[PDB]
Amino acid sequence: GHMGNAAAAKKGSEQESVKEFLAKAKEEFLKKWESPTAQLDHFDRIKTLGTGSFGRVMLVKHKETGNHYAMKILDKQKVVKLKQIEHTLNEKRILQAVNFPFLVKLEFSFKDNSNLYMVMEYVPGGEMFSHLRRIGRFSEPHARFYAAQIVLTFEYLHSLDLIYRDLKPENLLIDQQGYIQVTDFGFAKRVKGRTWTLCGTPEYLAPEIILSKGYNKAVDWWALGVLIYEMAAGYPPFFADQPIQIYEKIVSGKVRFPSHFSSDLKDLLRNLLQVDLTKRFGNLKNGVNDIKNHKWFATTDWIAIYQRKVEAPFIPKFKGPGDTSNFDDYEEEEIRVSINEKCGKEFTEF
């Protein structure tokens, strides 16, 4: 067969140890899920790091300790108008309960008359998006290093019956050691089987979302295919100026590859960017192992990636704990807090 005796036994034992790890991780998650912390004037607001639909993320400095954090600010009225109440509750509840080396850590959460706040660890290396647009494309080994971290992160999340639903370079930060931090749990959800909400980012949507199916966690494996393609090409596989044209390309499923892609990479991508759910990697009997054991990942030491012992391909320049040089500038808007409580009943659980 492909593996000799020693290699097959080593791989089998490794896979059983993953199962043992995941069983413990589920116990820990459920304890936090069942039995889960600051206020605004505890922080100085420094600078906007990024924006989004419901609000913005700001660099803040904690007054007492002097530690820096990234504070996501959501306007309650805007969340209600966009029917994102349950999504925002999901985001905070899930972030509070997970624990994995490549998932951003939530340190505090609170609300006031106008806004919801989530205070997370500040990741100063900037968005993968910026680095990718600046360099053009990542070489295959560089893309593979990041991809491996996503594979492990999705193996963890899916084992907990969590679906992520917004993978893209904009949501992946580079930490001081060159490893990835996944941010933005706005569409994350506990899903045992099917779910139905039409949400995500156009270029990354699986066909079954666009086609209004009751879809499953395999949408995240499709999105991994999009990410790997974009990292290695510099642009995503279904690329057009307007969402409607993007969707038409996705549903056709036709993918063309740059001539510099290796055959191993093309084979992996055809198996992730697979319309037919009975054939998509990550959705078969062998589960995540079809991905982890694929030839494109043959050089990947999965345990060493988890342990953060692989030398990263790129280390951001670090210029102090509150430095923001790896982020773009955004228009600043003062944080207005009404004297009247808004949407109290909708957000009681936050």
Binding site: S53, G186, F187, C199, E203, Y235, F239, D241, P243, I246
Partner: peptide
């Protein structure tokens, strides 16, 4: 031709 800037999430498809 396609989108090179930051891409916003969508909450529905009309």
């Amino acid at each position: 031709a396609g989108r090179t800037g930051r891409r916003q999430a969508i909450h529905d498809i009309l």
